[PDB]
């Protein structure tokens, strides 16, 4: 009994989304390492790497599970979505044989073919899901999903021999043969499904924007009963000032904002580019590795211009911010690999509208007193210290922040690195939900059929029979949700902005022709859809 | 057991990322984006940052002058201080294999603020040698990690060479030239991952968490 | 229900190792004898031989069952491994048809094909397993295992007619048609498994090195209470000497070493080579047959040089020693058959570190008294007898020795020849475990499909349809093991040396490129891994 | 019943290490304070201190509990050691004059 699965079901409790897509297994070569030496002149760093004949299914995004309309209803009626479960089923396996002839390529069923699939419930192989690498089902059903090959990075002893750093691999090099593991041989007419359930421990990710500025919550009517020290006068007077309720910037507050990198966003107009936005490394010029979204901050802020409420607001993209690259939708001969070093035009930028818990901000202590009169001219040296602008405002004990919202393309989960102690790891900087035990990587490969054996004559094994498998991939995921409790207010509350396409056409639809009749162009919004829809009092 | 993988390289070297990091702005507001390939380990945006780090110099100063104290939170310009020596969980000393033909004796780098167990005298008679004062100790056990660490030894928070930040670029409100790229003490952020120091064979087994109102990760001394 | 089997499981009691490999059955010709006449000028000796259309599976090595890492953990945590069981399962049988055309070779499934497999539980066919002949699964999964053809040697009446000896075969010639025996026809979608259990009588083979020199075990403090006769003085004085405890060489001992051949190892530098190392034969020059590892001794000893503790120790290879030939790992067009007479460069030499129960030794009675004064000048003749150096120190009643350790490539079992009386046969000189009833030879052959029958016209049967079978071969083996009881000692005990590759790269890993980009080179240690890891008091 | 205790026992679950050592109690003086004044020129900082006639037993190290070989096997076969318990017994007290 194979049934095509699809459609979503909303309930008050739970959201159940189901897709099915024809998938393909290319024949992947045998285990091959990919060793790319690093260079200190560039930013390259040595990777030992491995490539595997196996291929896995990466279903991890919201965009995969929620149809755009299903993502719309998600926000309208709900708040606090948390993922509950994930099923994946391979079914309708059919394995073609590609026979290359001078006549031509003739594909024909192989009644004898098979595929071999298994999942890691033991997490015993390098867990490659959740790093936001583009292997996903195309947004369009009817766009075949060709399963990504599986590979994994491993490190050796990494030495700086010269301008170029190389890994000699005399340690810590691992070779995982997935061949050696219990897997389930499948063949035409076999159904393999793997059900999985996220921890109950996952946090509820709010779908709604905080109402109030963090630092302005109080009664504008009364004066405070506290007196902040403004500064000293008349040599030791230490004048005190009692802030009125209205004074929002000046009122002492119980709870500080979360951390901030206070990075420049389009404040540098200079044509020069940062090699890397934020990188914790210990080479003056020798090397580095980025920590890009090092904090939970808007990657890009709307920041409405003021020229008569300019129609196109200036969108500020913070260095270290991240934008989802728009995939090519059934796009033929536009691959345009000739653009190198991965320059990407017009990515989805995840622009927040500055409904943030706290306005975008950059200076830890910004003030203009003049000298601090401790370390005032300089400390013990020529070094002029305790400079007022301090980058990276740090996390203090009393503190409050919200992580990034859920973009429609946001990754759903990721694997909290297996490590002794971790801190707020449940909120990944880059995505939805850190999980200790994630959805297993489901490894699939064509059962290899070798060619005719030689009578021990030339000792070169004939290449495997060229063949490929195509199958339905059922993947259903259940989300726990809570219907929104509307703030009880007398105002109609302006909805989150409906998506906008550069084209001006409706988003997530097939446009007839963009300078072609041939194929329709599926249109995605100019910017990343953000799951934050309605205010809620903080 | 030692962690296998570099923190920042865990992913499939085969695919390109589906994210685009902003590399920098061009042509006055172009804001060029770059999609890192899977292989690019340093350049790939990551969900989980390293733990804190003091980025202290280890044998990079060759100067015969010595630090009175390695790390000390105190509020006297010259009046007083008290050390916080192993202020973070970091290798106290890293092996850091030399490269001269894979030199047989690797240069062991001892981070200031690192700590080494003093070798006790084993039934050692009349070698007490108290005449050496101020507790100068020769050849202590240095707890040298081999740099199998979760993340390689590292020192700069934001290290880059753009030129001016073009916020507080020449200076802030003053002559003070601010937001200097090298920031010491890379701080603990909300998403973060680290491992505490391993268990040396001489490592103390327990300690008493000070009786105090609120403590943070006190279970790992 | 066919499931791919793999992975190992360690327990305190038992080790269970499982592999699965795509296998192939070539079409082997009909029964053909191979008769090679012998020559007395050379060492050749006549063999009647037989070749069979059948093919068998030889799974016998440790390297097959234990993944290198699984062999590592074997030593770290265990001692005394003994083999418990062996399962073999053929499954996922698929039988291609090779159609040769002027167009080209087109393989296509044959829904009608079959294979015919059976096992000898009666040992009624010549048992060919366990002689260390290279038919084994390649170390790399993904290296197809093409089952070896089956053949057997038989002897006739062997006469020296001339310089060349020939077997006339007027006796003792046997013809085994495996066709005539009960076997199980298999076809696409059939599962055939054969479970087997070693005797309980097998000895525990220690994985740990003896601590103490055999001849030095005693209290260094006391003097002995025995007096050895050193020699006679003053014409009949017969001076006696009481050895002190420290004197290890001179102290009389209850238990002698095992046998020894005291063979020269690299002491001959001469370019001349031994035709055969050790051969019990009765032809002055007419003929011989080797007994190569005639005793349990180190085949090769490390024997550390002294030049400032020279980094590369001089490895001494005892004549009659044996070394495992390194197989070519997915190695293409390096077959290099042009090297003839089987000259092999750089085999795995099974080098012991001289942790032996007794140091390497060569002289039975070595002494320099001068004449024995029995048979002193000569015996009854010119022959000068009872020469002090006696080769082949013999096994005496009180005696103690250890057999060779278990190399990672060591064969697991062998069949004790069916014979009236045998002596210590349970320890094969060359390998792991002699067994009375070994794992059955599992004979497999393609079910033969003849070509179109002629209308009795040319009376030459059309060749069989060219076809070959490929299938999964599950082979699981269980080992009984005992966790090590650590010698209770205050010292950390230096581990057995980790493997070393000539390349310097980590052993048992895929190296990217050796002067090629094309395929990775799987790297095996310079010398045979030895299963002896930690000392234990003897 | 006084028995000399020693030796370690490894199990899959738990590691049990035992040592026994002849110990001595010196006669320690009465309560004495040690007051060392601090100096800003140096790094010295004032400590009031106290010294007690009492003496305590500090058993706290891994090296104390794990014999080097017992520490070796610890690593070879195990991971994730956490301390479970600690017993201390004074016995065979004999007091010289």
Numbering used by the authors:
A (entry chain M), C (entry chain c): 15 to 552
B (entry chain b): 222 to 442
D (entry chain b): 15 to 111
What text does the study give?
Three-dimensional-image reconstruction of the PARV4 capsids, utilizing a total of 5248 individual particles, resulted in a resolution of 3.12 Å, based on an FSC threshold of 0.143. The reconstructed capsid of PARV4, the first structure of the genus Tetraparvovirus, displayed familiar surface features, similar to those observed in the capsids of other genera in the Parvovirinae subfamily, with channels at the icosahedral five-fold axes, protrusions near the three-fold axes, and depressions at the two-fold axes and surrounding the five-fold axes. Overall, the PARV4 capsid has a “flatter” appearance, similar to some densoviruses, since the three-fold protrusions do not project radially outwards and instead are positioned towards the two-fold, three-fold, and five-fold symmetry axes. This results in very small depressions at the two-fold axes and more segmented depressions surrounding the five-fold channel. While most viruses of the Parvovirinae subfamily possess three separated protrusions surrounding the three-fold symmetry axis, in PARV4, density near the three-fold axis fuses the three-fold protrusions in the shape of a concaved triangle. Structural order in the density map of the PARV4 VP started at lysine 15 (VP2 numbering). The amino acids in the VP monomer were generally well-ordered to the C-terminal leucine 552, with the exception of aa 380–401, located near the three-fold symmetry axis, where only diffuse electron density was observed at a sigma (σ) threshold of ~1, preventing reliable placement of the amino acid chain. The PARV4 capsid utilizes VR-II to form the five-fold channel; VR-I, VR-III, and VR-IX for the two-/five-fold wall; and VR-IV, VR-V, and VR-VIII for the three-fold protrusions. The fused three-fold protrusions are caused by VR-VIII with its subloop leading towards the three-fold symmetry axis.
